[PDB]
């Protein structure tokens, strides 16, 4: 009835990463966090615990330099939809390859890694 990944989204403090694969939101394996395909588009949700018990959300949609239009647009839309699912309490961030904000890059201790290639376009 509803997307399983939305049901997983923003329930626990931490970092969640999904990749856009053929007009769908797919989870990235945890052991591959920090490694992004330059030919794909990703969605990243950082969750933080507050004193009052509520959760803070930051949504960064990352766009590879070689990512296709369907992937870039999907990431954007997914971000809006995931923001609305989270009562709109999340702040959205557009992260382009090579101009990532300090906040985004700061999520990764061992640093941001780029990889060539990526999943095929949905077009």
């Amino acid at each position: 009835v509803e997307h399983p990944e939305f049901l997983k989204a923003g329930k626990e403090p931490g970092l969640q990463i999904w990749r856009v694969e053929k007009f769908d939101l797919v989870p990235v394996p945890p052991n591959l966090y920090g490694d992004f395909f330059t030919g794909d588009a990703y969605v990243i949700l950082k969750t933080v615990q507050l004193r009052n018990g509520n959760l803070q959300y930051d949504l960064h949609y990352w766009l590879g330099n070689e990512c296709s239009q369907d992937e870039s647009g999907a990431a954007a839309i997914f971000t809006v939809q995931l923001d609305d699912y989270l009562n709109g309490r999340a702040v959205q961030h557009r992260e382009v390859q090579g101009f990532e904000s300090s906040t985004f890059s700061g999520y990764f201790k061992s640093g941001l890694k780029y990889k060539k290639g990526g999943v095929a376009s949905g077009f």
Binding site: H3, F23, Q69, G73
Partner: peptide, 22 residues
């Protein structure tokens, strides 16, 4: 460059999403 059809392309993408099915 594709901005003559940018509107339509946005529709094509949006209506292709797994989440839009509902």
């Amino acid at each position: 460059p594709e901005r003559k059809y940018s509107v339509w392309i946005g529709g094509s993408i949006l209506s292709s999403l797994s989440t839009f099915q509902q």
